[PDB]
Write a protein that binds this ligand. Structure first.
Ligand SMILES: *[C@@H]1O[C@H](CO[C@@H]2O[C@@H](C)[C@@H](O)[C@@H](O)[C@@H]2O)[C@@H](O)[C@H](O)[C@H]1NC(C)=O
Ligand SMILES: *[C@@H]1O[C@H](CO)[C@@H](O)[C@H](O)[C@H]1NC(C)=O
Ligand SMILES: *[C@@H]1O[C@H](CO)[C@@H](O)[C@H](O)[C@H]1NC(C)=O
Lengths: 533, 535
């Protein structure tokens, strides 16, 4: 019985496990319950805090993955399987994980809290790419990750109702953040220094805690990687959530109380079986059950809240990868596949745009096509393919990120922005996809430091650089190394200069304007268009 | 006769002419100036199609330029060479239908390719007698036979009550057509080859050349064409029949006037009264918009220039087209608040937004906003210098560059051999401020060879540049190809194609080939804005 592996938290005693990291041991406390299992009459309901337990709770293994759809498009392919559940599925999944250095930190250590992505319909804190042992061992960080409900279980809503108020998945995350405030000191983490970080939906989630007052006293800094609370996919209106919910009810055969009561009797997989049949149009980068503008967790739309918020005492790091949209193209656009170079025709490009920008009118879709066509090579298949990727990546991530960076900076926040451009030597997706959505993560978590994973020695040095930026940012709100001249320095993003840095194998390079002309098209012109026509 | 220079006596269908021997840097040239080609379109003839000049007796003196067609005279900058060089240089009169011919001295041995110049001036001004249109250099150095004609402008040449008998519209274009017929019948008397006639012009002169290409009856009067900074398609070269009727009747009201009665009353008004109200009929405050221009009458223009260039067969046609580096600058000081030739014209964002409404007068609020968003440099959205140059670009692209890009593309896709250029050299002698760059109209003095005149103070490189350009234009007139058949060394000027979109830069440096004439931006004007319009 190793005393470094024994901790007492408000609910009782835990026993963690000593894990091996390249440079030494780390202490890990896996599968800690933070809420009562949201099962049975608790489905669709806000989480309740976990009741105290007797004895010593075993926290040496990952708990179950929240019930969710499992990808089958490319069976056996590592590019997709790496995101699939790696533990048993179950609605009983509200558990979090903590990694800390071994022996546990002498003094209070800044805490990093990871919120995974997966379109709000999938993901889990147990995936290999979210392994917190590297950051814990190399930087001495206390890393926390929680499971939160996805899909219908976490976001199906009958707005205004008592039994499916919506956003419970964000409330699960909030409860895990409260748990960190109340218990993280027992592990040597500083509750006064908590940095939230996440990617994609995880990033939009971090964004939603920034915009919801009750979350604000639970963290101090934030990192949003390829995702935002604003934008076309992260939220839906009350009306649309109600619409998708009742359409799902109907599809499984079911006054809000009775509808929800009937939904609660259905096996989990029945709900997942019809999840994807409620989207209003054929599309990509669109998810059935996501946060809802409820006038509660989200007092107004993310757009309204970021345009009028006071972000004075907040530091934020945000960024995108080089090819945000490639990955999504193979999941719905005719002509695209991971197995060929996906050289498409102009006709397939125009078709792709209606799928890529599903809420777009014919005039608006025409404007997108004319803006993205390279008029010197309007029929070149390679140009048309890369353009289709750009349309999807810009519309969904880059421009919504440029928009958020700008409002937070204009309104008092300290902002740092980046563009990640290194393509992992180990990537299994084809070259035409470039640096896809989600592939910067393994670097920030430091996986290249595991010699058995076969990353190049340059990638290992790169990952160390990134872990430093993130942890420096967590410690101080500034990603630059405190004692180190010559770098060059990563400057704050501002509305005036619009500076951001490229993260790749070469030293930091400062650039200006995040797709400035193109995002002006998405952020200023298209809005003006559709609100008139 | 008896003692006169035997090389200056020539006979044409209407009678005997006596020209004058003029001095050109490299030697003498023969000039026949002020040859009447139509009956004076005065009195009951105002607004009427021209009638061929009736024969005269004796020897008509053709030694000086004739009257300039009645027109508005610019006074915005009194005394300034930049504006005066375009002003009338001979008496104003409605009796102005005369043309000019320059030919080598002694006249060429065998038939020489003919170049016919059609001046610009927004269809409301101009004259073939201006110094920049002096044909003595092309005649002396390239042995060209050059012809230029005066054609009616303003109300006198384009006021129309479409469908009427007394003001059919497009008579100024008919004046030009009459002069082209005069060349077919008489140019051989001067040594010119009527079977090799190339039309060239700038701005409204260029749109004019374009209208002769789209009008069947003019097609048999020429073989090749050059359009400098102008097109028959675009926002200013033509108006609909309804709009022309509207402007004509509003002008009639302003001077105190059934079409016959209205026109008859207009004919009693002094020429100067019509000029004094010419600018009061435009529908919106604007720049690069002219009151009386060619009308889509369903006769001279069977349909809109857009329709005709989209559906025409341009199989056996060779065309040279181009623009200058800063097509819009000149126009900004005639109506956009914040611009002046006397200061740097650094403007604010608000002045830019206001300038766009004036520069794109037909644009809806949404369309004007799309223009502003497209032209704004989002890394420095408030920088005065960028906003100023952007205002110039908006005007130049909307009115000249994109309409030219559009024309080249349709002509090429439909059988024509097209050559395209962008002229980027700023005359060392320009008197407009530097911020205007190479303004609209300033490639002309180089194409005509004025730098070859030692007394005009051009640099020696400009003199060599002028010679290069004169060779390109005359080679094109001779063969339909600007390239010198011998010289393989000099890079070649390749044809413009929808596939490759090649065009050359014309400046002091050797030809440089470039691809895509403002391709992204012209896609905005030529493809997106129209579609915005359908809603
Ligand atoms: C540039 O000039 C514009 C028009 O002003 C006129 O021209 C200048 C040169 C003076 O002679 C003045 O008396 C005239 O009224 C101004 O509207 C514009 O703001 C000026 N730009 C600046 C700020 O210098
Ligand atoms: C790529 O493969 C998909 C299906 O496997 C097909 O629809 C598409 O046309 C292919 N494209 C190419 C490059 O042939
Ligand atoms: C040309 O330069 C001479 C010498 O400076 C000067 O006297 C003359 O006025 C100039 N003429 C022109 C065209 O500017």
């Amino acid at each position: 019985e190793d005393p470094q592996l024994l901790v007492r938290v408000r609910g009782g005693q835990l026993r963690g496990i000593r894990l091996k990291a390249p440079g030494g041991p780390v202490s890990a406390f896996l599968g800690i319950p933070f809420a009562e299992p949201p099962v049975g009459s608790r489905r669709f309901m806000p989480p309740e805090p976990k009741r105290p337990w007797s004895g010593v709770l075993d926290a040496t293994t990952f708990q179950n993955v929240c019930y969710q759809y499992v990808d089958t498009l490319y069976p056996g392919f590592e590019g997709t399987e790496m995101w699939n559940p790696n533990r048993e599925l179950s609605e009983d999944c509200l558990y979090l994980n903590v990694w800390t250095p071994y022996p546990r930190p002498a003094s209070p250590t800044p805490v990093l809290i990871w919120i995974y992505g997966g379109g709000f319909y999938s993901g889990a804190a147990s995936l290999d790419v979210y392994d917190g042992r590297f950051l814990a061992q190399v930087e001495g960080a206390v890393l926390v990750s929680m499971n939160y409900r996805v899909g219908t279980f976490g976001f199906l809503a009958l707005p205004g109702s008592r039994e499916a108020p919506g956003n419970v998945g964000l409330l699960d995350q909030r409860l895990a953040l409260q748990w960190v405030q109340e218990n993280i000191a027992a592990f040597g983490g500083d509750p006064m220094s908590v940095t939230l970080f996440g990617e994609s939906a995880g990033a939009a989630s971090v964004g939603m805690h920034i915009l919801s007052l009750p979350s604000r006293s639970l963290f101090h800094r934030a990192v949003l990687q390829s995702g935002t609370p604003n934008g076309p996919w992260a939220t839906v209106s009350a009306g649309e959530a109600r619409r998708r919910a009742t359409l799902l009810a109907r599809l499984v055969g079911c006054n809000d109380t009775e509808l929800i009561a009937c939904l609660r009797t259905r096996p989990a997989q029945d709900l997942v079986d019809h999840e994807w049949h409620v989207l209003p149009q054929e599309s990509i980068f669109r998810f059935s059950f996501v946060p809802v503008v409820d006038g509660d967790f989200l007092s107004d739309t993310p757009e309204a809240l970021i345009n009028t918020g006071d972000f004075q005492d907040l530091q934020v790091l945000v960024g995108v990868v080089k090819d945000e949209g490639s990955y999504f193209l193979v999941y719905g656009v005719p002509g695209f596949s991971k197995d060929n170079e996906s050289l498409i025709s102009r006709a397939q490009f125009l078709a792709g745009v209606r799928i890529g920008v599903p809420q777009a009118s014919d005039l608006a879709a025409e404007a997108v096509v004319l803006h993205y066509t390279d008029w010197l090579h309007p029929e070149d298949p390679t140009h048309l393919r890369d353009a289709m990727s750009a349309v999807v990546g810009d519309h969904n991530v880059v421009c919504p990120v440029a928009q958020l960076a700008g409002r937070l900076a204009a309104q008092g926040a300290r902002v740092y922005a980046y563009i990640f451009e290194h393509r992992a030597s180990t990537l299994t997706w084809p070259l035409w996809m470039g640096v896809p959505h989600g592939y910067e993560i393994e670097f920030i978590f430091g996986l290249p430091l595991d010699p058995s994973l076969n990353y190049t020695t340059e990638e290992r040095i790169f990952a160390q650089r990134l872990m430093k930026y993130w942890t420096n940012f967590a410690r101080t709100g500034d990603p630059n190394d405190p004692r180190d001249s010559k770098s060059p320095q990563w400057p704050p993003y501002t509305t005036a200069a619009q500076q951001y840095v490229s993260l790749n194998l070469k030293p930091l390079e400062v650039r200006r304007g995040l797709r400035a002309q193109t995002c002006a098209f998405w952020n200023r012109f298209l809005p003006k268009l559709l609100s008139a026509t």
